[PDB]
Design a protein around this ligand. Structure first.
Ligand SMILES: [Ca+2]
Ligand SMILES: [Ca+2]
Ligand SMILES: [Ca+2]
Ligand SMILES: [Ca+2]
Ligand SMILES: [Ca+2]
Ligand SMILES: [Ca+2]
Ligand SMILES: [Ca+2]
Ligand SMILES: [Ca+2]
Ligand SMILES: [Ca+2]
Ligand SMILES: [Ca+2]
Ligand SMILES: [Ca+2]
Ligand SMILES: [Ca+2]
Lengths: 246, 246, 246, 246, 246, 246
């Protein structure tokens, strides 16, 4: 039996996130093990989806699915999409199998067995499949009148994995590979999380890396801040989703 | 067995709405049949409510009930109300039996057996019972300070039915009857849907009509756009719902 | 059997709130009785939470828990917190046991056996435990650009109880005790409700008191108005919840 | 303000039901008023459905809809069906618009403006539309082996209304009319509730009537007992719902 | 960053429970700390309720509230009741504030700061307040006919706490105090859990104690087995909850 | 616009299933297309899970995950498991990522791009990974006393796909391949569904095949019957999931 004294606010905050990080590591590694490293099934993104949905403000929705645009083009299948449903309609889909208008998307994340060159490249491919889609923006009626259309922001993209393959972790080889992957704005990976205890992002332009027990809390609060900086999705042009129909 | 090749984004969008249109047609026509054309019970609006709730952005709530104002006046029973709950309180009601402050209302729709003169007139009567109610508007605290009260918008009103009775569909006789019904701003019917495959609206001032497989997707996206143009409900004056109480 | 004629809108509004007031009185008094006036357990705040959650606009969340700040400091256990989750993250908690960032808080209420001097003082102590916590505010990206940080508002605090102990109700002795308790901005009690049928608030600076069947509807609409005047919580500085972590 | 002392268990039980009875009376009478006695819309059964769903054991499901049998025959639209979903499949319907296999049904109730001869006859017609449908019963695999098919029970049927029209309440004229209506096993009305404060049933063969504040609690506990006596629905013959399909 | 290899089934089972044990320890100890050892509020039982609800088979319901019998008698306020809702009605209550018929109860648990003599005695007092209530049992209609009434079983009772106060844990002093408390069948404590890592039960008549990382999984599986041995609650006599009403 | 007359019960039953079959075909084929025939992601089983969960009686639970036994052994990742939660505990998992005791399992289904030899073999491999796991069975307390342990039944296994690859559909080549796959009781595929419009099963020992619009309704009702014949899962031995723990 553990000797328990008292728990203070800082300690409880750390534990509330680190124990969830350990739970995610256990679940995602079970899935990686059972699927033989993603070769006999996809790593099960569901518990990651649940945790990020629980954390994120309710202005954000979180699910897996496919992104579509008003030109009829589709992304690849995306493991985790962070998107708007407060202002943007739902295309008569349901939880676990979304078909999302590109205008609604804030961020996308791919869940892979490990952070390595191969899987960074795959996650960047998924990102590009979303960022290549066309997005509309229209005027906005509000308390102060009608605002001009909001400029689109770059969609945030990342990778979530069980661990980091390089022996030195997220080190020089990692940053060189990330710099090379992110040599195309459609392919940029802004952030990533390994639930064994590492995270990175380029939100401040320079690559910032964290390791250890607080990786999840760092990843989530830093992502919160990046999302904050984006504002709300622009107003979808409803005309363009019906203009080719008879 | 059907020969299935591949499904593209445009095709999936069309099917996702047209198959729901067919499902609604089947359900609403069952209800029309069982009730002997609305004479032994009301056409069951519940599946329509579910579909429009699923489609609409989450800033909108959808339910059946009664609308009330700060003068104690009530509308008739309304089959489908699109309304705000993000800023406007709930009068201790529950799903399926709402008692809604008039300030919260964006739109109302009546579900009837068919689109014909009699049922257009009934749907216009229901609309007028809502539009006659009194609505308040107060100042709005926001990030930029306090905005002056927002001007009210006209509530949108429409009809949903199984089919269209005129042999020529939504044709010259229809537009003349709609023009005559909508000769009173309280009675105007802005839009309508027959799930057999027709829709209309006057959102662009002229009457625009669509028929066939895409009626539902047209109706929903055009309604989305009309709603977009309205902004958010004005801020309710909380004083007027308690000013006659001791 | 009661003779029932008809029900009008004003009458239904009054009943919809007064019958809920009677239900709350019955439940809270059962809890007060079973716990021997709070001495063998806390008065069960759950049904109060349900009613205020049902009434309040969906921009507000309602639950019990603990408030924490970016300095690691905690409030006492709070019976009812009205707070934001639309813009502010959730610290991986669940319903009934929240751990809430101080920036999210609009109001706090303590549930006690009765309104008397002792319990007013306890409710003021709980309020101060929340108001002493540190709150951040950052710039706000929005359709019109980026707004400067929003100034914090004073958190609203109150007391909910079964009845009022003074024989004269909320009278001269009450207002003197409330004036003395509220001689410290951190300890101010802005409002209160006794479900036997009394309420008070200082929203208009002078103390306004109501008694009888409409106490609940007065309390809720007046609180709605006070909340309205506050706007939305300022934007949390995400940096300060991770700045002490390695 | 009301003087509140203490609440004991018996008192809380009575209040928990009588206050809900008053709430239902208020809601159903609002609906009766707004619809002009059922002539401009159906009385809204939704709050009744919610209360009986809340009370009844979870082996029972409660909703509105249509009952269908394996011969393709349908009942009329039914305001409240008490039915099984634990052993009996759902025909891909949703809440508020059920399409229920006759084998699943325990009881049906019709909601009308008042208890009078006309509305008793209508409620009996609805009952007969359900009881005329064909029901199957097959062997039952269980811990002790396989049981022979269970014999069907008579479906329970009743009426729910706002009040009772006869000046003498549920008196001699009522019992004579109920005796005449229930002169056909398909048309029998086993029970009824007027939320103004009356109930009746023939569960003990003789007609038993209650009036006043405890009408709802009597109706619900007596119905519970009648349901108890029926056991679980027999096992549906899955073959008969697909035997006419190619 | 942690080195992660693979996760096997046994390892994942252990982690899935031990990490939840650590989470509960963190939460319950926060609550114990904030409330100053239960003296400024009750330890928050909500997260315990969530975990046991999640684990237990769906034949069991779990909540806090008060137990009542057909004689109008009430228990004290109970932190966690495991009870039936599949066969036994709900007395128009809601989650977090149940008013439960004694016939429905399988088990009760009290949440306290620590396992010590004082808190064992308090948990035994709570148990006795439930076990003293009167329970009915009636015949049971089922596929094989009608069974005679089922004999009542003893309600299971226990204690949940953060840790164990004795320096030697659940040792000789503990077993002597538990033996003395459990010298009255109404006061018997069958089991207990300290989330720091200890559990006990007398399910096999002798006291069996476990310590360490697997305390939660032991407690839950052993409780599952004890519950299994009880069968389903007997059939409530519906007559006795209405026999004193007019 | 379609000419709509009336809808009868048989017609509505057929449409309610066939339109859902068309919806599933559209969704699953979108997923097959976007994933390049399962090579760039798994076919999204989520909408299939939703439909079968909606249809099946509530004694059955439906989800994806991994099956585990009391020996610590795991199945492969399973796309759809039909299992018990009414009597069998949940191993602290959540929807979309279940970790299921083998004793709880009634059936398993694998979702693949098409019915062909390769994918039949893969679905049989998944089945065997579940059927190889160890299952316990203990005595059962019930109204009639204590029953001896229930004998285990063979788990049902199948395949769900978009279409059938053989030009002749489910013909001679299919039945020979199914006969060869099912030459090992652990590998037997009892049933399958192609949402383009074919289904098969061996529930009656001989292979029965259906094609066309009614494939889904046939598959679901025939599966219902097969499940019916199995009874309820045996009672899990709670001891064996904790016997290797210290
Ligand atoms: Ca287009
Ligand atoms: Ca993946
Ligand atoms: Ca007024
Ligand atoms: Ca209607
Ligand atoms: Ca800090
Ligand atoms: Ca309190
Ligand atoms: Ca048939
Ligand atoms: Ca009716
Ligand atoms: Ca009694
Ligand atoms: Ca306690
Ligand atoms: Ca074992
Ligand atoms: Ca698959």
């Amino acid at each position: 039996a553990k000797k328990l004294s008292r728990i203070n606010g800082r300690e409880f905050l750390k534990q509330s996130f680190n124990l969830q990080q350990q739970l995610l590591a256990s679940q995602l590694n079970l899935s990686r093990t059972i699927t033989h490293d993603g070769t006999m099934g996809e790593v099960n993104e569901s518990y990651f989806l649940s945790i990020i949905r629980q954390y994120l403000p309710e202005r954000y929705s979180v699910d897996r699915g496919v992104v579509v645009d008003s030109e009829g083009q589709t992304s690849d299948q995306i493991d985790a999409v962070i998107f708007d449903r407060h202002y943007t309609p739902t295309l008569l889909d349901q939880q676990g199998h979304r078909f999302i208008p590109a205008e609604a998307v804030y961020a996308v994340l791919e869940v892979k067995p490990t952070i390595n060159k191969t899987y960074l490249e795959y996650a960047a491919d998924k990102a590009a499949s979303v960022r290549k889609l066309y997005r509309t923006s229209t005027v906005i009626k509000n308390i102060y009148g009608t605002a001009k259309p909001v400029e689109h922001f770059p969609i945030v993209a990342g990778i979530v994995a069980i661990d980091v393959e390089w022996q030195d972790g997220l080190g020089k080889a990692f940053t060189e590979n990330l710099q090379a992957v992110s040599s195309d704005e459609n392919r940029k990976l802004d952030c990533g999380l390994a639930v064994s205890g590492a995270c990175f992002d380029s939100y401040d332009e320079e690559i910032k890396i964290r390791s250890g027990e607080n990786a999840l809390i760092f990843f989530l609060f830093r992502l919160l801040g990046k999302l904050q900086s984006l504002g709300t999705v622009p107003a979808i042009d409803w005309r363009v989703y019906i203009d080719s129909l008879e």
